Symmetry: C2
């Protein structure tokens, strides 16, 4: 019932003008500025403005209309302002607002994603991939946004520069490798969905597998291999089972190992075997082979697959402590 | 360096549209609404808007220009919206904003005080005078505004209707009779300043004395008289000293007691004497009479006057415990 229609442009105008007031105060007096009562008020109005615009958009019922008339002026007021400002001055509500228009408009704004990523993707990433849990709110909204593009504007991932997509996977990997069991599971959730969306893009699926399949596999295993971290074992099994099943069912037509083009099954078996032999040279060769065989054997029974993994971590922990 | 000129119009426009959004949500679904995230965001934007405007006005440098060009639209957007709303939806920053413009513009907006008081005085007063410490922020801002007007737009107190001017005094009395030292001293400080302001209004001065002098005197004593309440004794002494000095110097030309027109000195002596006798029938007439004479004797030595009062409390206290 929130109606912002008649003051919508007025709100964006106030937003842009307050942004400049904030920048100017920073370009002249540093970040300490951000603590002054009035600069805080200006930040608040920018923040609450996005929340209101977000709630207004999340309950509209004419996606094309919103996409053509409201989104353009919104991106004009928030994108470049977020990109060119010091981290201490970027409103995290800008990321959450993008996520909200994506979940609401999907395909109607897919063409807009590149423009949005160029403005908030890499700079936001550099703010959160720093171990130190600084900018926890941006980290949250970052993944809400990524989860949204992945869900309703998937094509955009192929649209952006391959080098940028590489960073997309890097943040996902970084996320499911995080100690905060909450972040890690959003990463695994994103990774699972992404792999499924990739399978729908038969045109580009092979390039993806060829480029990222083994990498992703290696990283997932590095996490399950890590002592004391049964956290998310369910999703690891879920993802691994899915990936192994793709190979067994011959969904990956390209030869993952272009070097020595053999069966992906044969290559994958050796590949995973080596990963494990390396991480644990103490492991008996024939037992590693049996463990890997079971990964394909149980690739369609997640609960069984999970237990299979669990048992193997005991055939390692016990051999240590 | 807050440059609102560019967006002032827009800000007031958003303020007005959000108010309507809030009113509609309330006047349709009860007060409970005010707790919803979006209604809160609206309220916050309205609040920060006033803070930004207040801060901008406080650093302006052309009082006349501001009063003729910025105050009118501001009052159009905030006054009636404040008055006709439910207490739970009246922004206390409206009161503080009014105080700031009064303290900055003074006589340039004296003509607007009547309009401001009609919109925020009584409704606010009724919100705070309820013993229960509710709306503690409105209360604080209420007196900040009252002080502003008293200090810079005194004449207005003569312009508003006498019945309203009587509510002004009632609230000042109510405040210095409060349990909170903080509130009480604000009341005493306002009272002292208003008494002085009245002295400069020769024409209206006599009318004031004739109507309020004895009442004020009685209320002050009722507080000084109260057991366990040494709080603000210095101010009580300062005010009483001032009042008795006015009478001794014949500044009150009109006859306080129109009934039995005698010397204000003679009448005032009996007046305070009886006040004390009624409240404390256990006091000796001659002892009371001496205490009163001492009030004129020391009316120009506040420290001595204060000690005079302190000693009299003991010539009452110990007679109990």
């Amino acid at each position: 019932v929130i109606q912002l229609g008649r003051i919508y442009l007025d709100m964006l105008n106030v937003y842009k003008c307050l942004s400049e007031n904030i920048s100017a105060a920073i370009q002249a007096n540093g970040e300490m500025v951000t603590k002054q009562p009035l600069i805080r008020s200006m930040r608040t109005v920018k923040r609450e403005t996005l929340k209101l615009i977000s709630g207004w958009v999340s309950r509209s019922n004419d996606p094309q209309m919103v996409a053509e008339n409201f989104v353009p002026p919104l991106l004009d007021a928030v994108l470049i302002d977020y990109q060119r400002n010091v981290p201490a001055a970027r409103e995290p509500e800008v990321l959450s607002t993008m996520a909200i228009i994506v979940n609401k408009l999907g395909g109607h704004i897919t063409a807009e994603i590149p423009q949005i990523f160029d403005a908030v993707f890499e700079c936001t990433l550099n703010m959160i991939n720093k171990d130190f849990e600084e900018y926890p709110e941006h980290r949250t909204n970052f993944f809400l946004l990524l989860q949204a593009v992945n869900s309703h504007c998937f094509p955009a991932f192929l649209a952006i520069p391959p080098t940028q997509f590489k960073l997309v996977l890097d943040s996902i990997i970084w996320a499911f490798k995080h100690t905060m069991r909450n972040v890690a599971d959003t990463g695994l959730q994103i990774l699972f969905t992404l792999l499924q969306n990739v399978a729908q893009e038969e045109a580009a699926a092979q390039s993806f597998y060829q480029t990222y399949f083994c990498d992703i596999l290696q990283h997932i295993f590095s996490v399950v291999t890590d002592t004391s971290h049964t956290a998310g074992l369910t999703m690891h099994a879920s993802i691994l089972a899915y990936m192994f099943n793709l190979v067994e069912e011959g969904k990956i037509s390209t030869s993952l190992n272009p070097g020595n083009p053999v069966n992906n099954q044969i290559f994958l078996q050796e590949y995973v075997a080596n990963l494990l032999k390396s991480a644990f040279p103490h492991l008996q060769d024939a037992q590693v082979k049996l463990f890997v065989t079971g990964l394909f054997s149980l690739n369609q029974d997640i609960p069984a697959f999970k237990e299979h993994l669990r048992d193997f971590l005991v055939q390692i922990k016990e051999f240590a402590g």
